[PDB]
Design a protein. Structure first.
Ligand code: HEM
Ligand code: HEM
Ligand code: HEM
Ligand code: HEM
Lengths: 146, 140, 140, 146
């Protein structure tokens, strides 16, 4: 997908401020809490009975770290998200059979986490840039369904 | 089905938003138009640039509808009936678009209420906005 | 909100399906598994090959739930409450999947009732299935 | 998207029996009737107040003919739906701003029309083949959003 230079700017600048050890876990947790059917794929994670259990669950934080890893990679290759996500697409589509609508949901959750963490700095134009990004990632991740 | 805890969460967020509600409504609209440009087709007679007095005025209307839903959360279908007719019959609003606006509303709250936007309240708000959206798309 | 005309349309289609309902339920399931293979994940202990006695038996259950919804169309939330709990709490069924099954149910009716599947009845059935789906996803 | 030879077979064989002057209009009509917000894009078509008005509307039938034309074209180029639909994608996305979810809906409506018209011949495996097809068309038509 194609971001303008002003959008690439808006995106990369904010992303440099992201705590890569935290935000992934924060987004994965909210996904599990806000869209509970997603918990279906994470039963091995243990206690997920309450929001506090989810967010303080050490497996959630550790696995979230990997998830953000991929988003970071995608940010690194905006003009080739398809190649970047080929392997993850095989995993999520052919192996796990996750419905691709949840790729969109996780992207939107991440956006809410960024908004929360950056507040006023997460302006409407900055969000718009990020929306192109998470949409591009969901589409690439869903390639094996297409 | 909103739980008793959802109701208190939403009420609490609403309360904290306070008199910014109208202004946050306008902001949610702007975020929607910029992030999801297809939605702009529904407002062809609106100027949608930053600072538009029309978007400001309309955001208050939107906020006002939402607070009315909050204040009558145990009978949203009745409270929002006139608005559901408008959105389905007259405007013919695509159901997908309610998800887009609901997301922008969450983002806006999140960008303004750091203490309140916990995972739990986030969940409660999303459910609240999905219920409002269900009502507003119930009349096609 | 189902209209009086929607109610009679659905009732009429239901009536014409008659005692095939269970068999058509099984068929809708099969069409779902084949067309949308992701849905199969929810039935890992089922054999889903053609002629499966399990899919047959389950299709009757599904059909039975739908006829119960038809027979209590003015209070679906109450009639389907136990089933909505099951689908949300215990099974954790992804909301997208209700659209997939609803489509397969329409296809099945269409492939069996040439006289009844008019554009109007098609509309009424789709609304009926969307309302059932709304109820079954109301409990997360 | 990739159909098996058995699926290509299932698809092309049925499609040869399709009335190309009728089915397009039948599907467009149902789209307008079942998903009334779509009428938003077709106000110039005149009377759409009732299902009978929609289905007997001569503009609906004529424009439906073109719509099926494109599906036929897509059936002709399964392994390159993206190139086939480039122009239509610009039109539907950049010009008209139709939400791509309605591309999926029209495809599903077409599937219901085929089921109706072919009955028992429209078997679960045949439908599955067609589902890959309409999904491929919706994805290609939505390329300009991606
Ligand atoms: C933008 C969307 C997504 C991204 C970028 C993403 C990224 C990742 C990454 C990087 C991994 C680790 C891969 C590895 O261990 O080598 C992973 C694993 C996993 N993901 Fe996701 N994911 C996404 C969406 C989802 C969603 C929505 C679900 C479920 C609702 C899901 C379910 C899983 C599961 C169950 C695993 C563990 C697989 C295993 O280790 O066997 N993913 N994902
Ligand atoms: C949370 C969901 C929504 C709420 C609470 C809401 C609220 C409102 C309210 C209060 C009005 C003014 C009503 C009146 O004057 O009687 C309105 C009008 C309108 N809404 Fe919404 N709305 C929602 C979703 C949407 C969406 C998703 C769209 C389109 C993408 C939309 C498009 C419009 C349009 C085009 C008007 C008329 C504006 C005009 O011509 O003045 N609404 N809405
Ligand atoms: C029109 C919507 C639906 C209806 C009317 C329906 C109906 C039913 C009924 C009557 C049962 C048995 C209930 C009982 O034994 O107490 C059942 C169970 C079940 N349903 Fe559904 N269902 C619907 C949608 C779905 C969807 C979309 C999925 C997944 C894609 C699904 C997956 C399941 C599963 C996994 C079971 C349990 C099967 C077992 O382990 O025996 N259902 N459903
Ligand atoms: C698989 C999905 C679709 C296909 C294959 C398709 C195909 C076509 C074709 C072949 C045309 C005529 C192009 C021409 O005149 O050169 C057209 C025009 C048009 N379509 Fe579609 N269409 C699809 C979905 C939709 C949907 C869902 C909507 C609205 C809800 C829509 C709205 C329109 C409108 C308003 C025109 C007239 C444009 C004009 O002449 O200015 N399309 N489409």
């Amino acid at each position: 997908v194609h971001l303008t230079p002003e959008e690439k700017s808006a995106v990369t600048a904010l992303w440099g401020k992201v705590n890569v050890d935290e935000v992934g876990g924060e987004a994965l947790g909210r996904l599990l809490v806000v869209y509970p059917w997603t918990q279906r794929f994470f039963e091995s994670f243990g206690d997920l009975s309450t929001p506090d259990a989810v967010m303080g669950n050490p497996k959630v934080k550790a696995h979230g770290k990997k998830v953000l890893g991929a988003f970071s990679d995608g940010l690194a290759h905006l003009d080739n998200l398809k190649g970047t996500f080929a392997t993850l697409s095989e995993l999520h589509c052919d192996k796990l059979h996750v419905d691709p609508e949840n790729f969109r949901l996780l992207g939107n959750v991440l956006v809410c986490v960024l908004a929360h963490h950056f507040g006023k700095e997460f302006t409407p134009p900055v969000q718009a840039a990020y929306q192109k990004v998470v949409a591009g990632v969901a589409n690439a991740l869903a390639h094996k369904y297409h | 089905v909103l739980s008793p805890a959802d109701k208190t969460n939403v009420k609490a967020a609403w309360g904290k938003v306070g008199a910014h509600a109208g202004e946050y409504g306008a902001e949610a609209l702007e975020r929607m138009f910029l992030s999801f440009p297809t939605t702009k087709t529904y407002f062809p007679h609106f100027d949608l640039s930053h600072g538009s007095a029309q978007v400001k005025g309309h955001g208050k209307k939107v906020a006002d509808a939402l607070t009315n839903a909050v204040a009558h959360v145990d009978d949203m279908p009745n409270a929002l009936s006139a608005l559901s007719d408008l959105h389905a019959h007259k405007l013919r609003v695509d159901p997908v678009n309610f998800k887009l606006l609901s997301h922008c509303l969450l983002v806006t709250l999140a960008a303004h209420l750091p203490a309140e936007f916990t995972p739990a309240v986030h969940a409660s708000l999303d459910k609240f906005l999905a219920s409002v959206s269900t009502v507003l798309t119930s009349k096609y």
